[PDB]
Paper text:
Two PGL proteins, PGL-1 and PGL-3, are key scaffolding proteins required for proper P granule assembly. PGL proteins can self-assemble into granules, both in vitro using purified recombinant protein9,11,12 and in intestinal nematode cells or mammalian cells in culture when expressed on their own. These in vitro PGL granules display liquid droplet behavior, indicating that PGL protein alone is sufficient to recapitulate the biophysical properties of P granules in nematode cells. Assays for granule assembly in mammalian cells implicated the conserved N-terminal region of PGL as critical, and structural studies identified a central dimerization domain (DD) within that conserved region.
We determined the Caenorhabditis japonica PGL-1 NtDD crystal structure to 1.5 Å. The NtDD has a novel fold consisting of 11 alpha helices and a single N-terminal beta strand. The asymmetric unit (ASU) was composed of four NtDD domains, which were structurally similar (RMSD 0.219–0.254, C-alpha chains B-D aligned to C-alpha A) except amino acid G114, and the first three N-terminal residues could not be visualized in all of the copies of the ASU. While each ASU possessed two pairs of identical interfaces, one of these interface pairs consisted of a network of conserved amino acid side chains making extensive salt bridges and hydrogen bonds. The complexity and conservation of these interactions suggested biological relevance. Recombinant PGL-1 and PGL-3 NtDD each dimerized on a sizing column combined with multi-angle light scattering (SEC-MALS). PGL-1 and PGL-3 NtDD interface mutants formed monomers rather than dimers in solution. We conclude that the dimers observed in the crystal structure represent the NtDD dimer detected in solution. Therefore, PGL proteins possess two dimerization domains. Based on insights from the NtDD structure, we designed two distinct PGL-1 mutant proteins that are unable to dimerize in vitro and are severely compromised in vivo for assembly into P granules and fertility.
Numbering used by the authors:
A (entry chain C): 1 to 113, 115 to 215
B (entry chain A): 4 to 215
Write the structure that this text describes.
């Protein structure tokens, strides 16, 4: 969107900040994901349980940055790249370089530009952001806490805060793509999954059925 | 017996309903003659620098004639205030047993504290993922109980602001001494969040918090 603001969007029961084009894809293509998942998008097929083939980095980047993406789409998807960790940081820097010609930049560019000191400054920034009363500030706080997490369990704990903004879909997608479900987190992942399924059961039962079954 | 947030004329609270009522009922006193006001209220609202006693706090949390819901809510407050209030918590819980009532976190007051806290940690993490205020309050309470140091306690109590329970976070900060060089900027945000609401109903009382 032609805005710099972090905004939650929704598509037919799927509320999302980090993955709007994935949500839209799934809403449009649910019958294809049921009936011929190998011809469907591999990121969507994996997330929704239609395929056990993990998407590539390229598959993910393509969904995050479709052709004709505007500045708000790019900046939002750059947040997603940061949350996705080191395999996506070179892509983040590329997208940030592209924006500079337009006098645009990612607001957390201090990371990519003494990372320890940036992360401590960001830690304080995120703690104050969370105390603000807006969704945009709370998303920023969760992003910072996720970036500053060192191990998977901490990262899962901080991403789980997305469920407090009814962003269970995003927490679920990150859990799937980053491999955060293990013996310690499994019961909590099940609650997150069930929160998302509770919304899906009302709008896209086919998608719910794939996630539950196959 | 459900955990229910309440409000008194601009003061939204879970943990301190009788403190909020006291402020509604003694507005003028706190603004105009605070040396005559209740010491816990006077301290919280910035009218006095004298810290309240344990008994002062307990009497506001458990007024004479308190019913079982009031008792159970205030026992949550005792647990959040920490080990200094555990003997009071156990006494209140023992008295409830005759009526077939108990606090739902009674395992804390029994054997093996460490094992109970590990079990409560997992329950709190699942509770926070539920979509109700009652479950989210339980999760914050557990996370506070399981915090050892002031900074961690402050971080977990700050989550009350996500339920617009800034008043409660502010009261706990005042009573537990959580404001220091590391937390002062965040305490100011929490205070201002509460005052932004209090300004709409009792601006002269909000002014005492700002200015003494």
């Amino acid at each position: 969107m032609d805005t710099n603001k972090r905004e939650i969007v929704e598509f037919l029961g799927i509320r999302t900040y980090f993955f709007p084009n994935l949500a839209l894809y799934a809403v449009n293509n649910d019958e294809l994901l049921v009936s011929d998942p190998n011809k469907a998008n591999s990121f969507a097929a994996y997330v929704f349980g239609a395929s056990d083939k993990k998407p590539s980095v390229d598959d993910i980047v393509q969904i995050l940055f479709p052709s004709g993406s505007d500045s708000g789409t790019i900046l939002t998807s750059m947040d997603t790249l940061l949350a996705l960790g080191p395999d996506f940081l070179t892509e983040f820097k590329k997208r940030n370089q592209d924006l500079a010609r337009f006098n645009l930049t990612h607001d957390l560019s201090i990371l990519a530009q003494d990372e320890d000191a940036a992360k401590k400054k960001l830690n304080l920034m995120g703690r104050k952001a969370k105390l603000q009363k807006t969704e945009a500030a709370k998303i920023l706080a969760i992003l910072i806490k996720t970036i500053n997490s060192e191990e998977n369990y901490e990262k899962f704990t901080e991403l789980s805060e997305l469920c407090g903004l009814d962003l269970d879909f995003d927490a679920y997608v990150f859990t799937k793509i980053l491999g955060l479900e293990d013996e310690d987190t499994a019961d909590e992942v099940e609650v997150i999954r069930d929160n998302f399924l509770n919304r899906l059961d009302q709008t896209k039962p086919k998608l719910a059925d794939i996630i539950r079954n196959g």
